[PDB]
Amino acid sequence: ARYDSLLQALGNTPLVGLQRLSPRWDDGRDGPHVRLWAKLEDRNPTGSIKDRPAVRMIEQAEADGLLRPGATILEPTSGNTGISLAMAARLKGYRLICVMPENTSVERRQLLELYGAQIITAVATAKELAATNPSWVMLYQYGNPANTDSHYCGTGPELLADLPEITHFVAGLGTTGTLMGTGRFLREHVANVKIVAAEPRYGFVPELYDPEILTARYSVGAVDAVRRTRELVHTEGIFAGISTGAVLHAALGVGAGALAAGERADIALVVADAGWKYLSTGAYAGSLDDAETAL
Amino acid sequence: ARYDSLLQALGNTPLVGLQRLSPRWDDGRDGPHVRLWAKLEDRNPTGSIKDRPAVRMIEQAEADGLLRPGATILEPTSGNTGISLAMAARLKGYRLICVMPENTSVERRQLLELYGAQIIFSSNTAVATAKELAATNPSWVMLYQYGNPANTDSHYCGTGPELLADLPEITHFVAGLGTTGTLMGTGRFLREHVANVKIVAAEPRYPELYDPEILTARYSVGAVDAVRRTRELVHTEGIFAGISTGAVLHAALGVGAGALAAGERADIALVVADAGWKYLSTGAYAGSLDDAETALE
Ligand SMILES: O=C(Nc1cccc(-c2ccccc2)c1)Nc1ccc(C(=O)O)c(O)c1
Ligand SMILES: O=C(Nc1cccc(-c2ccccc2)c1)Nc1ccc(C(=O)O)c(O)c1
Ligand SMILES: *Cc1c(COP(=O)(O)O)cnc(C)c1O
Ligand SMILES: *Cc1c(COP(=O)(O)O)cnc(C)c1O
């Protein structure tokens, strides 16, 4: 565990059994086990899963000759990808400018500046800004196969190593990188694997998306998401972000499926970031209806 | 990396070279290297170093027969130790009640309840209230992190061995001094294996575990210095740490400048104890440093 740079202290995230919240942790008289396992991607340099594609997208753009020393990077995001890229650019000697509206909160804005980024439909605006300079590159996490590659070459191998007996992989669907990359890999090695997606109730379709890979899709409501998140910290001591709530809700559906049909299940689910940056929204305390409108 | 419980997903935290912020990362014509290495103890179940002694103190109290199934735990803390114990108690089947003042914020309070703790407040009133609750029924226990050798043991048996393994060539270990667990435990261990090791403490300007023999230096750090360093650390190295890391880093840069001036090698390990997330609401990462200084108190 000795790294000459933070960029290497990346991935190799733990997988943790959720014994209290699993439908059936122990095999028994009433049937085989139905287990949830949690992949803690919040144990990453910036505390989110986006550290994986961020570093990969920079290394690929280098390899394709787009990125020369002292160059400048551009991307549409004011969230987790922004943070990740800013960390990674700073360390690779690059300059960053992120792509967001004025509307975007003071919290998100100041966090990016703290990491050293600079501040500026939004996908299109960005493409135009890259077309301004030869040394200005736009990585495009929504289209970039390096996003999908980072999970193919990291996340999937780690899961399979920790959980050879895996039956399902559940994860949030945003850029689609996680599900595409991890699902492509898991299918190759575990033929019977099911790849389940969790998403918000209502946008665009990413170039990375391939529908064949998914077995199922769950549309999750705010109240459900929040409730699950809260259950997850109350019961398991894991303080996750809101997308984990959605993922967990979907994973409990799947799990209830296996339990009803008397089958084994080992369900791996992605904890993509922690609850720290969602705390200011009150959503962890008070009523769930307060929390729903407060999001 | 497959764990049947979160309690095992603990320790084995990474050590990361700070190349930009190090006084001299490369050995050269002008002299030997002077390096800072960062032990990322924010990569822990609850995001702080207190996960290590919290789990240890529960396992020891079990072994000493204080903790039977369904029992209840008590401690003076509304911070990181409280969070850690609440996580750990919940998973070991125990009940928790924490001990705090009125002053303590709504943030800290709600975070503890979110982990499942219960609430008692007035720092020493609160220690005494807890004492009373152990006297209610003998199966209610107070772990006493400030006195408990299991606190010191967790760094002796984990933190130190991990450092030495990653950094055999270590010359200094720098860490914040609160309960003293980190410095005592890690320093006792490092001295046994690296004779010439220097154990430097960082603390703020104005415990039974404390042993003075162990420290080679003490640094008193001002709020403005602390905050500035924290900020430098995220700008330059991409590591978003808590305020105590700022203090630690300030001390580690003093030590480091020493070694550079005297033409000596240095490999200085320093503890990043938690992350900046829970300190962000205080504005201290933005604005003026004088705003940040008064906004912390
Ligand atoms: O896709 C995301 N979240 C997500 C995924 C799946 C489900 C939910 C969700 C959250 C609350 C309620 C219901 C669904 C949320 N997050 C996400 C965050 C950051 C970025 C980024 O580019 O910076 C992103 O592309 C997606
Ligand atoms: O020891 C701590 N911080 C620390 C240590 C050393 C130096 C400083 C510091 C911070 C700002 C300016 C100057 C010094 C701060 N924190 C700490 C947090 C929680 C607990 C707990 O028991 O719950 C604790 O015992 C200590
Ligand atoms: C990116 C992200 C997701 C979705 O992951 P993709 O691989 O982009 O689909 C979910 N939750 C959080 C917190 C994220 O940052
Ligand atoms: C506990 C703690 C310290 C001090 O550690 P001790 O081993 O108790 O001296 C410093 N910083 C943070 C954030 C802590 O939680």
For residue A293, give the CATH number of its domain: 3.40.50.1100
Phi, psi dihedrals of residue B223, rounded to the nearest 5°: -50, -45
* β-pair type (A2-3, A265-271): unpaired
| Ligand 1 contact, A176 CB (< 6 A) | no
**Distance separating alpha carbons of residues A273 and A13, to the nearest angstrom:** 12
The tally of CA atoms less than 13 A away on the side-chain side of residue A126 is: 23
Residues B296, B167, single domain; the answer is yes
Q: How far is the CA of B8 from the centre of ligand 1 (A)?
A: 29
Residues B33, B165, single domain; the answer is yes
- Cβ atoms of B256 and B36 within 8 Å: the answer is yes
- The angle that helices B223-237 and B243-261 make with each other, rounded to 10 degrees, is 80
3-state helix, strand, coil in chain B (%, to 5): 45, 20, 35
User: A112 CA to chain B: closest CA distance, Å?
Assistant: 10
Q: How many CB atoms within 10 Å of residue A101?
A: 10
- The angle that helices A242-260 and A222-236 make with each other, rounded to 10 degrees, is 80
Q: How far apart are the first and last CA of chain A?
A: 38
Cα distances (Å, whole numbers) of residue B139 to A89, B61, B93, B115: 54, 11, 14, 22
Sign of CA dihedral B102, B108, B114, B118: negative
**Distance separating alpha carbons of residues A41 and B220, to the nearest angstrom:** 36
DSSP A216: E
- Cβ atoms of B116 and B96 within 8 Å: the answer is yes
Rounded to a whole number of angstroms, the CA Rg of chain B reads 20
Residues A100, A85, single domain; the answer is yes
Cα distances (Å, whole numbers) of residue B188 to A80, B194, B201: 40, 10, 14
**Distance separating alpha carbons of residues B118 and B109, to the nearest angstrom:** 9
Which atom of ligand 3 sits closest to the CA of residue A175?
8
Of A158, A237, A276, the CB nearest to B45: A237
| Ligand 4 contact, B174 CB (< 6 A) | no
* B54 is a domain residue: yes
Of A6, A43, A235, the CB nearest to B238: A6
Within chain B, what is the greatest distance between any pair of CA atoms? 69
**Distance separating alpha carbons of residues B244 and B219, to the nearest angstrom:** 13
| Ligand 2 contact, B226 CB (< 6 A) | yes
**Distance separating alpha carbons of residues B90 and B3, to the nearest angstrom:** 17
Residues A130, A193, single domain; the answer is no
The tally of CA atoms less than 13 A away on the side-chain side of residue A153 is: 12
Residues B265, B168, single domain; the answer is yes
Of A1, A87, A239, the CB nearest to B14: A1
**Distance separating alpha carbons of residues B155 and B13, to the nearest angstrom:** 12
Q: Where on the phi/psi map is residue B65: left (φ > 0), alpha (ψ -120 to 50), or beta?
A: left
Residues A26, A50, single domain; the answer is no
List residues bridging with A136 in a β-sheet.
A72
Residues of B in contact with A13 (CB under 8 A): 1
Residues of A in contact with B90 (CB under 8 A): 234-237
Among B145, B174, B202, residue at a domain's last position: B145
DSSP A270: E
Which token pair is B294?
């008064």
| Chain A contact present for B139, CB below 8 A | no
* A150 is a domain residue: no
Q: Which amino acid is at B128?
A: A
- Cβ atoms of A219 and A196 within 8 Å: the answer is no
Cα distances (Å, whole numbers) of residue A198 to A195, A224, A242, B4: 10, 12, 12, 25
* A147 is a domain residue: no
- Cβ atoms of A295 and A200 within 8 Å: the answer is no
Contacts of B73 (CB under 8 A, 6+ apart): B58, B67, B85, B89, B94, B95, B96, B97, B140, B141, B142, B143
**Distance separating alpha carbons of residues A120 and A101, to the nearest angstrom:** 7
Contact B277 A47 (CB under 8 A): yes
Contact A5 B19 (CB under 8 A): yes
3-state helix, strand, coil in chain A (%, to 5): 40, 20, 40
Residues B21, B70, single domain; the answer is no
Q: How far is the CA of B239 from the centre of ligand 4 (A)?
A: 18
Domain that holds residue B35: 1-43+159-297
Question: In 3D, which of B142, B214, B148 has the Cα closest to residue B177?
Answer: B214
Consecutive H or E run containing A51 = helix A51-63
The alpha helices in B155-280, defined as continuous H runs, are 160-166, 181-193, 223-237, 243-261
List residues bridging with B271 in a β-sheet.
B39
| Three-class DSSP category at B256 | helix
Phi, psi dihedrals of residue B69, rounded to the nearest 5°: -55, 135
Residues of A in contact with B43 (CB under 8 A): 43
Cα distances (Å, whole numbers) of residue A15 to A12, A18, A166: 9, 10, 12
- Cβ atoms of A123 and A104 within 8 Å: the answer is no
Sign of CA dihedral A163, B40, B176, B204: negative
Q: How many CB atoms within 10 Å of residue B136?
A: 10
Of A13, A47, A237, the CB nearest to B90: A237
The alpha helices in chain B, defined as continuous H runs, are 51-63, 80-91, 106-115, 125-136, 149-154, 160-166, 181-193, 223-237, 243-261, 289-296
E strand residue ranges, chain A? 2-3, 15-17, 34-40, 72-76, 95-99, 136-138, 168-172, 194-200, 216-220, 265-271
Buried b vs exposed e over A269-288: b needs ≥16 C-beta within 10 Å? bbbbbbbbbbbeeebbeeee
The tally of CA atoms less than 13 A away on the side-chain side of residue B68 is: 4
- Cβ atoms of B127 and B76 within 8 Å: the answer is yes
**Distance separating alpha carbons of residues B227 and B246, to the nearest angstrom:** 6
Q: Which amino acid is at B135?
A: A
Among A88, A113, A141, residue at a domain's last position: A141
- Cβ atoms of B248 and B174 within 8 Å: the answer is yes
| Three-class DSSP category at A28 | strand
Residue window 222-251, chain B: list those with CB within 8 Å of chain A: 231, 234-240
Residues B35, B54, single domain; the answer is no
Which of A75, A140, A144, A175 for a ligand 3 pocket mutation test, highest count of atoms within 8 Å of Cβ? A175
**Distance separating alpha carbons of residues B93 and B227, to the nearest angstrom:** 39
Place of tokens 């001094």: B177
Residues of B in contact with A1 (CB under 8 A): 12-15, 162, 165-166
Question: Do the annotations mark residue B180 as ligand-binding?
Answer: yes
Count of the separate structural domains present in chain B: 2
**Distance separating alpha carbons of residues A214 and B208, to the nearest angstrom:** 58
- Cβ atoms of B140 and B75 within 8 Å: the answer is no
Resolution (angstroms) equals 2.7
**Distance separating alpha carbons of residues A92 and B66, to the nearest angstrom:** 52
Phi, psi dihedrals of residue A51, rounded to the nearest 5°: -55, -35
Residues B111, B76, single domain; the answer is yes
**Distance separating alpha carbons of residues B240 and B285, to the nearest angstrom:** 10
- Cβ atoms of A236 and A20 within 8 Å: the answer is yes
* B154 is a domain residue: no
Residues A86, A220, single domain; the answer is no
